[PDB]
From a paper:
In this study we compared the structural, biochemical and biophysical properties of a highly expressed full-length Env trimer from an elite neutralizer who was infected with a subtype B virus (AMC011), with those of the corresponding sequence matched AMC011 SOSIP trimer. Using cryo-EM we generated structural models of the full-length AMC011 Env trimer bound to either the PGT145 Fab or the PGT151 Fab. Both of these quaternary specific bNAbs bind to and stabilize a similar conformation that resembles all previously reported membrane-derived and soluble SOSIP Env structures.
We next compared the structure and orientation of PGT145 bound to full-length AMC011 trimer and PGT145 bound to the BG505 SOSIP.664 trimer. Interestingly, when the Env trimers were aligned we found that the PGT145 Fab was tilted by 23° and rotated by 4.5° when bound to the AMC011 trimer compared to when bound to the BG505 SOSIP.664 trimer. Therefore, the trimer and PGT145 Fab were fit independently into the AMC011-PGT145 map to generate a pseudo-atomic model. Finally, to determine whether the difference in angle of approach was due to the SOSIP mutations or whether it was strain specific, we compared a NS-EM reconstruction of the AMC011 SOSIP trimer bound to PGT145 Fab with the structure of the previously mentioned full-length AMC011 trimer bound to PGT145 Fab. The comparison showed that the PGT145 apex bNAb approach is similar in both the SOSIP and the full-length trimer. This observation suggests that PGT145 binds different Env trimers at subtly different angles, potentially as a means to navigate apex glycans.
Numbering used by the authors:
A (entry chain D): 518 to 554, 569 to 664
B (entry chain F): 518 to 557, 566 to 664
C (entry chain B): 518 to 558, 566 to 664
D (entry chain C): 31 to 135, 150 to 309, 312 to 321, 321A, 322 to 354, 356 to 395, 413 to 464, 464A, ...
E (entry chain A): 31 to 139, 150 to 309, 312 to 322, 322A, 323 to 354, 356 to 395, 413 to 464, 464A, ...
F (entry chain E): 31 to 59, 64 to 138, 150 to 309, 312 to 321, 321A, 322 to 354, 356 to 395, 413 to 464, ...
G (entry chain L): 2 to 113
H (entry chain H): 1 to 52, 52A, 52B, 52C, 53 to 65, 68 to 82, 82A, 82B, ...
Write the structure that this text describes.
Amino acid sequence: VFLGFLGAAGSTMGAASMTLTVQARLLLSGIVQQQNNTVWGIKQLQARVLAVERYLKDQQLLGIWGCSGKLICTTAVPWNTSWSNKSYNQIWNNMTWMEWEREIDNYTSLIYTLIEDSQNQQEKNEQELLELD
Amino acid sequence: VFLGFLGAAGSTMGAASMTLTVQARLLLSGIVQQQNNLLRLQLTVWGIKQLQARVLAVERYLKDQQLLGIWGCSGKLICTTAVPWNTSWSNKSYNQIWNNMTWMEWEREIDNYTSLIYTLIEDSQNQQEKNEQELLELD
Amino acid sequence: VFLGFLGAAGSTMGAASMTLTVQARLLLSGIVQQQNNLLRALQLTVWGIKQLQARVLAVERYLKDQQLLGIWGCSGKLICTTAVPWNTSWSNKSYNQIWNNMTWMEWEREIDNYTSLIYTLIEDSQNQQEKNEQELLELD
Amino acid sequence: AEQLWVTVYYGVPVWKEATTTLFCASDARAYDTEVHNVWATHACVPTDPNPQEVVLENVTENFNMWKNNMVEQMHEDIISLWDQSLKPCVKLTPLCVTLNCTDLREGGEIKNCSFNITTSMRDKVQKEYALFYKLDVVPIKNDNTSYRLISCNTSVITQACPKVSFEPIPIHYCAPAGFAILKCNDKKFNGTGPCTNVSTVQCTHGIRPVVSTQLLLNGSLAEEEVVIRSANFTDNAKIIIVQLNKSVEINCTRPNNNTRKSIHIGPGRAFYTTGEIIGDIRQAHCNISGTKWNDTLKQIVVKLKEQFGNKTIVFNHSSGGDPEIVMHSFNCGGEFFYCNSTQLFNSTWTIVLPCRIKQIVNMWQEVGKAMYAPPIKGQIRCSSNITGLILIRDGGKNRSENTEIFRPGGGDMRDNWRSELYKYKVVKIEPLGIAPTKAKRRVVQ
Amino acid sequence: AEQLWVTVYYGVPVWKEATTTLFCASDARAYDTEVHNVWATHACVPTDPNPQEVVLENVTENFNMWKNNMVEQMHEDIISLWDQSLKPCVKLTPLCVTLNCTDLRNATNEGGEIKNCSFNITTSMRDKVQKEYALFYKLDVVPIKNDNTSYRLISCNTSVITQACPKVSFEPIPIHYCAPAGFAILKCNDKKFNGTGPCTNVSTVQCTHGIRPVVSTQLLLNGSLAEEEVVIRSANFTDNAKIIIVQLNKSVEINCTRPNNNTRKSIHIGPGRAFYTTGEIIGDIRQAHCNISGTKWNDTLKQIVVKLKEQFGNKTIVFNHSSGGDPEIVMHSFNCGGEFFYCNSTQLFNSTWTIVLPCRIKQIVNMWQEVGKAMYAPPIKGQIRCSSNITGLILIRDGGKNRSENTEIFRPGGGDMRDNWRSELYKYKVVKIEPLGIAPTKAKRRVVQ
Amino acid sequence: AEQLWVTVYYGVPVWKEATTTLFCASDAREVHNVWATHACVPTDPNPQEVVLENVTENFNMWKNNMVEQMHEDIISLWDQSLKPCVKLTPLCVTLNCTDLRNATEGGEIKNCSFNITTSMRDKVQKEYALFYKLDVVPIKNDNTSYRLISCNTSVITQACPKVSFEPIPIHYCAPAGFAILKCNDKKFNGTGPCTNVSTVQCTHGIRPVVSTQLLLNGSLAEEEVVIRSANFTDNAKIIIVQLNKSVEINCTRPNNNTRKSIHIGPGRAFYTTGEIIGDIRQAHCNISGTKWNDTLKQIVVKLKEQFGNKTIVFNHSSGGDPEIVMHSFNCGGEFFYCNSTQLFNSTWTIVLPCRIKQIVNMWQEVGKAMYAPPIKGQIRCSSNITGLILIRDGGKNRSENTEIFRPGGGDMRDNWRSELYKYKVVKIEPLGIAPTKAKRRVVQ
Amino acid sequence: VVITQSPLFLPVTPGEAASLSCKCSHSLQHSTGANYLAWYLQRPGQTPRLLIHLATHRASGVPDRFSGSGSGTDFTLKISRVESDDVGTYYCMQGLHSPWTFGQGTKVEIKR
Amino acid sequence: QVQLVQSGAEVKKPGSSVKVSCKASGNSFSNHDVHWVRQATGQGLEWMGWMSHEGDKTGLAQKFQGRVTITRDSGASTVYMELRGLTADDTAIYYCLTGSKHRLRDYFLYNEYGPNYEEWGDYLATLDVWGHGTAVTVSS
Ligand SMILES: *[C@@H]1O[C@H](CO)[C@@H](O[C@@H]2O[C@H](CO)[C@@H](O)[C@H](O)[C@H]2NC(C)=O)[C@H](O)[C@H]1NC(C)=O
Ligand SMILES: *[C@@H]1O[C@H](CO)[C@@H](O)[C@H](O)[C@H]1NC(C)=O
């Protein structure tokens, strides 16, 4: 038994690998209580609409980030040229995901830029060449 | 030609594979009727219900698409990563059901084993397969 | 460039096909809605009501076309090849003549009377082939 | 044993019962009746001129007409839609004032009464005259035969908004996306157990229900013979609904030419009441095609015997009670007439049925917000036809088979609406599922 | 013959006419205030300071200055916002009561247009009667026969909201509009476009410029100017059933004033509900007025008249005096600070081919040219000044059953927000973007089975 | 370095504080209780524990936008329930009052005659109704006549008595994409990381407390009474005490009989007190003295620990207005007032005398009272004390052993915090990069 | 309410002032304000004459010999410089809300 | 000055009756109230009763309740005072009111739809100097 949104929170990148499929199975909701019918008369839909946008935004974004719908792939963007000098072993074995993710607040825009230019558009440029023949 | 929507219910389990594209159209069917409301505030009983219906149809569709996405099945009519299973549930042959009876009969039971089904659904989320893939990318 | 909706309107496909892959980057305008959605709420006014309705409708259109790519065996592709012959969808003009002179907004006019074939022929025959091949592969 | 994998790709359409929401559609035009909120009031979509239907060769399905709960949802919506149309329109609470009158130029059903109201300027009180019905007032002692509004001391006092007529519009439903309609498409089905010509239906039929009691008018007809259905007529706790295979003409007129007068209720308000009568004052009645009615009585009588073993003499007149259970009725153009139906059945086995109008009514036979129905000048004609009726046995009968007496009944509008839903179910479709097949395993490493 | 297959990448420039909805895009300033209309821009989405605009190149597109949806939807949205604004405000049925009115007083240190009116009115307690005292304008009241010319509320016969709410009402500001995703805005551009048919300089628009849904009657204020010359447009300028709008290529100076005054006395009628009283005039009593040079009027009117003579066939037809109409039509109104000015336009219209227009002010108005209910503008403390915003003119036309075609009087009309806003909005069109990556060509799919 | 290529793996959590809208949820099944009003989402039949074994999380008891949201909702619900109902102003008109005679004490209960102008336009009928000591405005130039206190600039009435409220343990919870985390960290100081954090699928049901000083019929502390504040040295703050063990209260009715009403119009009625059976002075609340005193002993000890000395925490009188002096309560929806300074007197079985007030100021920013309809039959109320809110200020000290803690108060928001103090609603978010030495098996 | 007018007889030295009074044993006022004061005189051979003194109101023709005021249970009328011309019976009027009647009558005469 | 007309002096037997006709010259009575009194020789005045020109009437002194009836000629603007049961003690000079009453009210009450529950009809506005008046006596 894995806890998805919970439990996995205490894991390292390596240890957390076992639960990645679990929060993914749990994303947003089980929607049962929403299908089985105050401000909520309006806000219920506003909440559902926004949940939908987050869902789709992330799937479309993953496509920008190369792979979407088939787990996750790596791209030709070296992590360490837009990052700090902590060892990847600290990251994979001796650090949990949330600490690492907090460090990213000052690097997230560097990677988004690299992704739009490379993981997204240059991979597409290379894909166009492959599909030539 | 084809029978039309829910045409599969009129035939056998094997025959029913003939509707996989019909049902994909069934998901989209009704989008094509809603635009005529947009051609005529709107915060009334029918207005709210049709908006709710549009939102709910999407929510359900996305949940099914997400599950296919979990498996990596999405994008194909037939996807496959066979998962051997606890065939204590059924000792029927495949032809006994596939070429013999309607899937509507098949589906009459099934939920009695929904937990067997979910166990397989959980294993089917590339629970181990994802590791084999990571290892190949690495080495 | 962003040629396609953003300026390919002035040229035909025989030439436009050289740049119309770039349209994949206009999808980032959908991503940007995540910033627009940071707007606080608290009761909705006229605009708030219409904007939420608009988001739902945009989603249905998005999904309609993504669902078709799935149906057509074109998911995740810029161009997928569905091997559908002219059949009865042909206007009396060569495709080479058409592409060189394929103003998109003139060309679609032929399609207006052939669209039922475009969708029927692709969705039906593409899946018949894929379904059969995939079922056979599962067995060997 | 070969390696199996149990799965079905999305697209094998498992049926689950639908629980909610219908898609309203109609043969829409820029009608003044949409502008005037006559029946449909807002988002009913222009429909599909060619709805599709699929017959399923191997499908039959259990159906129970009293489980057609989608009807409840529709009735609740018509109430809500009209409730919205009526707000804040025509509040008539300030008009409960007394009326003084004895007659008008049969008995004095309608009287010419004097009264004063204030409003429409707080500096003045103004006396005026209008016509009132005995059916809508309560007598007061010691003041030239005084009356008060019958609704004066109860609930909510309102009026139908004057621009709004209430002509039934045949709006239909096509169900929301992800849903479909399953129709029986057969004959001589009893409303229970399986039906057999099952088909997928995109849309069904428009309905034109009216406020009525004992009578079902302008609905659908039976294919060959009158059809009698009840969830279970074994009990006198259930109700019998009768569908005719032939309609019978209904023909009422005002039958005189009235006028309308204003009611100055307040600033910006709609202002109307009942005015003068042009020409002679005459009594309303419907001229009913009795010959056709009598043929239907013969068929009804036969079906009330065929379904009832060896019972012989059946059916008789009503037990009495309020007009809502006793008289047949029709809101003709929003005119709520009640007619004495006795001539249609004063026995056991041309008709002219006198009519009266109740102007203040609960059009939903509940809620309590009874509304006044103002007239429009001149005489009108109410052209319509009988398509069915409501009956039930009393159970207070003696112990012989010689007689079994059913009397005219009544019910909720949703109980009559089920007669359309009688032939179909709304189904939720969930196409993803499982089934064992020989299948190759994908091995990555 | 090579055999075929179908599909291209979508994003092909194929579109259809859009359904109409407008996505409100804010100026990112609206959130800093406490008033209505701006609040609707507060409850809106701030947009990108540098929007994308892309030329379609060798393309024409059909634009119609007198057609389809975009302004009509703005019309309805504004009304709905207007009603949301006033719904919470008081109706005061008792305000209709007749008051004893005498002329407005001042220090002893024009006619009796403003009067001192009073009455004994029942208050929030049903057995208590209070003295009502307030200033009123003749334009807002009706004299009573055989009662010392006492006065009643002029709008009493209809539904009246007897409060605009002093902490709510305010002039509208420009809102940008965006197409929803899946839609796009096209704009004609095209210097001196005729208003109908194909537009040759069309570009794709990532939201419109800000369009300010502000009110004036007949005369267009606070909009945009013509690129070079006045732009004179009608669906059919020779069709006397149509009316012509003129855009200016130069703005016209406007200097309108209304003298300093106070507000006072919230008078409760109901349980937390009151009438807010017009206070005293501070200093001398004078009417509102507008000061505009004839140079600017003549320079623009001359160009306009010459162009009309040319459009109609080198005729001797001219700009000329108005036929009149309801007072709200005869006078050309505007809203400054929430005050409603009605200026006597005959200063400009009584002409053929330091001008000061007296202006009246009125408290009871309908919104725009809508009918049914009415509401009033609460008194505004301080003084009102309006300036430098004439950007377009007035819709003009004539008829005539005379045998001679030598003369024609182009007389004014408009003030209908659909027509007024349409005169600028029409530059934009909204289309549906269909990602139809569809096209037959040669070759086959690399299929194994 | 190695080919430390970028991948994006998520499916492991990250989160942010939520600013979303939560919904009403309960054991949903006519609603005559405003807290639900008419509808509520069905509850979770299987809440899970789910523990974040290696994770601590930073909680703050006094920083919670969801309690604020609960306030927005209680106000909305109060108004939604009576919004379509009857508002009455004829009642502003005065009454002729006299002391009530009971069967054979000041003019605490009065029999008052009101002139009724309702039902028909040409008639006015005087009639009697009964009113309590917490009366309306006396007339300065008359003899024992009164005008309505709630008139002036407001209209206050029980617009539709069929629906009212008694606190119901209705819970609420997060929409899709949101989750609730809770502290299982015992004796948490109210600020900073919680040692043991676990899931909340939905919250515990909450029964609102609408009054000051005491917190009744809520949840209890484990082991010992818990005293907390945003700042314990800042006298501007109120310190809240959760009890570990509750104190029993049993209240008794002044009478057992009926109510009367004025016909205003066709669907409009106004209720006042009707005939009285019994000695009306008997209304009272029976509270165990011993348990209250033992409860205070534990509170006093915890307070001493918080100053680090053998302090005196004196119950000096507070309030200055009965609505903030007495823990009044809406038993049956009607407000009872007794003597909170009798139960907790100037210290550091008790039977409190009680009174009834129908017009009681709401927590709503409008500054208007809610009117409680009279209740027919009899009043019986029971609950246990589950907490106490205390205040100390003024600088009246001069000794390390002296403090003045007496019953205080705050908002409904602050009373609701008792449950919300244990949890936070967070937004579920995707993650970023999971970089490694791998390279994609690219064909391109 | 009742009304009396002490002393009911005032023989005077001509030129001497008279002081007349009203007692009603009821608190009178206009219910809307000031008390209602009125008085009338009937000289021998005459019908009544008015001496209203309604705070600010007097009948036209009343000389400055006459003035008065009051409220509640009583009021007075003073006549300065009483002459033989003023001989007659002085009546004090009641308030107007009980409803009203008339005075008692006080004789003023010149002393013999 | 309006000439005030009254019936001339009369003597009746005990238990009898007389009618006093009070015509206002110029018909001023149409705008004035009438209230009528008795002044016995050597006595003050008492009202028997009152009537407005508007038709609002009542007796006043509770001794004439069945002794005096008051009516009017609305055309001739003449009021008739009919005295019955005349005895020796009824010898007096009788006078009609001059001057006026206003419809004073001092109890205001309105409901939400504005019905009027006001208390009114108090306050004499002016005082009544009449003309000679007329003697009525009784003898035998
Ligand atoms: C407002 O107050 C004035 C006060 O003068 C009312 O006018 C009448 O004044 C005369 C003067 O003798 C009184 O006798 C009347 O009784 C007054 N009328 C009333 C109703 O009191 C005036 O009518 C008042 N207006 C209203 C609407 O009450
Ligand atoms: C008008 O109202 C008065 C109130 O007393 C009543 O007497 C009169 O009869 C009313 N008029 C009518 C026509 O009823």
